[PDB]
Design a protein around this ligand. Structure first.
Ligand SMILES: OC[C@H]1O[C@@H](O[C@H]2[C@H](O)[C@@H](O)[C@@H](O)O[C@@H]2CO)[C@H](O)[C@@H](O)[C@H]1O
Ligand SMILES: OC[C@H]1O[C@@H](O[C@H]2[C@H](O)[C@@H](O)[C@@H](O)O[C@@H]2CO)[C@H](O)[C@@H](O)[C@H]1O
Ligand SMILES: OC[C@H]1O[C@@H](O[C@H]2[C@H](O)[C@@H](O)[C@@H](O)O[C@@H]2CO)[C@H](O)[C@@H](O)[C@H]1O
Ligand SMILES: OC[C@H]1O[C@@H](O[C@H]2[C@H](O)[C@@H](O)[C@@H](O)O[C@@H]2CO)[C@H](O)[C@@H](O)[C@H]1O
Ligand SMILES: [Ca+2]
Ligand SMILES: [Ca+2]
Ligand SMILES: [Ca+2]
Ligand SMILES: [Ca+2]
Ligand SMILES: [Mn+2]
Ligand SMILES: [Mn+2]
Ligand SMILES: [Mn+2]
Ligand SMILES: [Mn+2]
Lengths: 232, 232, 232, 232
């Protein structure tokens, strides 16, 4: 089988294994801070530098993957705690949308909320322009921040959240488990055909953004990943 | 929300939080050995002592859960390495089937392979009477060891195996990610309506068995679990 | 290490992790009300359903534990309030004393004020028959409501009180910190050898009671707990 | 009663309510990083600016206090993870010792390991010169880093640790409860007469240090405190 795996317990600029885009910054504690609290419509994204082959045009096989990461969002006096973080998968040449307004676009979509990507968002502000639920929520996005499906969630300021994601190639099911600070878990799952939505080689990463009045701390603390593609 | 969670990095006799059934034994290193290498048709089961309410007849809500565990199977001279381990969910009154022949029933079913339980098996012997695939395999079992679905797998003697399971109540999807000793992952997912197959209160646990000629070391090394039921 | 931990931010009827005894009722807001305002000598107790092994006869080790909880007592028109709440530890088979007169026995002792339990009381009425101090008080009880030690305190009707308790196994010290609504803290500590006063397996819970003329609202709002026993 | 209480969920440079000493720095995420990873024998300390009156010379009374805080330590490539963090109480005019060598002195003592303070240390390196236990440990320090008492502990890189401390004036008992990342708790308690060891007014704070080859990330994430002195 074709397996790719990595595990970061701390990050650092200068590490060739990671690409940085936008206002991203690496704190002295190894944490990744995606947005710049002093910029309007800030957008920051981080990606595993090496593209991963999720499916094969030769065999038609699609990869299965297991990934978990931990992040932290915290309020700052005195802006609206927004907009959130999104774990995404996109073409290997993915870039921050030209003329990105950040905000509710989470740094992956245009003003209409469209883009080429599949992801799991941890959304902390309700943008009616993208049909968001009225509360904080976790959502599965397929080429749009107008989530295909969402589940109520609660973003606790300063709390460390743990996430586990499993993609089963056979059933094409993407299931997500979010462990909150207080111990409660939140789950959401959706059938998503990566073969039909994305190219053979993609990049995995995290993105976050803010607006003029919407800003908050977006930190990525750790990230382990393993994908296995059966080549037969 | 109604949440139940626990974490076992090791086990010790006398812990009220755990229920032992059959030939279970706790080793000095804190590991749990499920079968007795000197008994014919040995069967051993360990269960979380407290019943978990996976669904409420009052609301109709079903709980989501996240659990991870690690186990190890090791060959012994001069017996056949069998039969395997099964992580299962069963009614709270669950007991080792009367007159259990162990072996391919994995300690959860009758001679015909039927029983009242839902589980994930790590099967190391191919029983044609229960329509097993021709190789080692992971399977999703619903009231029978004749798996609803299986995926090829390989049990490596002495290898520590890590497993992660997510059950999403909304989609009723049970997804499993198995991390093999060599780094590759194996996944299998299946939609299973726990509310339709099981009572409101159930017990979670592990079971293993052997026959006269089939015996091996079945070890459970760790187990973390969290289920959250929405009460509203 | 053998660890038991749970966290209740709210309570619900039907949760198998909780045992109800006497006049206990679960309010729609998730709060637990211990006594019945319309009954003479009302007694209500709630216990964590699973017995906890606080010490091992094998090693002689005693567990350390950390627990915090919040409660509220509110006066009603026009009864005396009367009698209070007690956080207790007792044999796993503990039940409301037969023929309990409620009142100053706090639902845990007999008429003489004796019983089998260790606890921290938040006493709002002065029973001279149990040598109570003349004012509201917090006390450490060991097999009797005639406290081994008490400290002055003030029960404010309708005020949410937060409590933190630490039991250090090495020194066998039980320390309590009570945070009043006005920000002021009250502390009390006492050396109590749980190994000598209680059986290996015990249950933790809260009890409240009243009399014909003494009645008030006794509410448990939240409860988190963690006990760790060194096994080696 | 005289009560002092504050709560910090994040810190900021410029907040007059805090004294910054040495290499301390505040990250853009609100965390306080005590030591500088690029300096030899780095020492950084943070103190609550307002001195607290822990005892009255007029009444002989000592104050009781309840404090809880969370911190994080993380290894860096490639130095020994040292030396640790200490929560301390010292004279109001306390400053980092002149010519401090950092390292095992934890920033509060001279080369002999002596100083004027009382504290709880989270020690991650074993200094034989100060009679340290052979493993990571939590210790109670009274005017010396040669702990009056210690308990085995385990510092996990990148894990958030929660600590609760209660000081009971009557019994003069200082009890500590440490909640590790995996849920396990570690406790330690010791009778310490604050009035005989410290002056009437003191400052509370944190300190950390490193050596030439011993360095790690020492972060303070949050801190809540309440002290009550009975004046009568
Ligand atoms: O409050 C946070 C949200 O702000 C929205 O944009 C605001 C903007 O921040 C404010 O300066 C002004 O221009 O009004 C806008 C409309 O609400 C973002 O669109 C949203 O994503 C949040 O960040
Ligand atoms: O070889 C392992 C398998 O044994 C099967 O049972 C055997 C038994 O071990 C042998 O002594 C003889 O009685 O024939 C039996 C039938 O084949 C089990 O049924 C199977 O589960 C494996 O354990
Ligand atoms: O005033 C509250 C206290 O009442 C005591 O019991 C009273 C009882 O309420 C009254 O009706 C009469 O019978 O005299 C009793 C003895 O004083 C309780 O003993 C005490 O615990 C409080 O509840
Ligand atoms: O390895 C961490 C410990 O270092 C000790 O100091 C070392 C120093 O790091 C090294 O460069 C050389 O000078 O030898 C010293 C003595 O062994 C500290 O004393 C100790 O506290 C740890 O930080
Ligand atoms: Ca949004
Ligand atoms: Ca089989
Ligand atoms: Ca009383
Ligand atoms: Ca040291
Ligand atoms: Mn959204
Ligand atoms: Mn099978
Ligand atoms: Mn009393
Ligand atoms: Mn030390």
């Amino acid at each position: 089988a074709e397996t790719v795996s990595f595990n970061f317990n701390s990050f650092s600029e200068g590490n060739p294994a990671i690409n940085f885009q936008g206002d991203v910054t690496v704190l002295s504690n190894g944490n990744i801070q995606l947005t710049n609290l002093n910029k309007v419509n800030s957008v920051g994204r981080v990606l595993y530098a090496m593209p991963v082959r999720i499916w094969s045009s030769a065999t038609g096989n699609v990869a299965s993957f297991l990934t978990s990461f931990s992040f932290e969002m915290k309020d700052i006096k005195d802006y609206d705690p927004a907009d959130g973080i999104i774990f995404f998968i996109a073409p290997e040449d993915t870039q921050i949308p030209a003329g990105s307004i950040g905000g509710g676009t989470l740094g992956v979509s245009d003003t209409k909320g469209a883009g080429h990507f599949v992801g799991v968002e941890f959304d902390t502000y309700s943008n009616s322009e993208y049909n968001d639920p009225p509360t904080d929520h976790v959502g599965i996005d397929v080429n749009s921040v107008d989530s295909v499906k969402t589940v109520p969630w609660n973003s606790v300021s300063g709390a460390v959240v743990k996430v586990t994601v499993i993609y089963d190639s056979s059933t094409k099911t993407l299931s997500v488990a979010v462990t909150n600070d207080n111990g409660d878990i939140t789950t959401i799952a959706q059938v998503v055909d990566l073969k039909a939505k994305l190219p053979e080689r993609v990049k995995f990463g995290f993105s976050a953004s803010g607006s003029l009045g919407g800003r908050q701390i977006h930190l990525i603390r750790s990230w382990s990943f393993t994908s296995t593609l059966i080549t037969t």
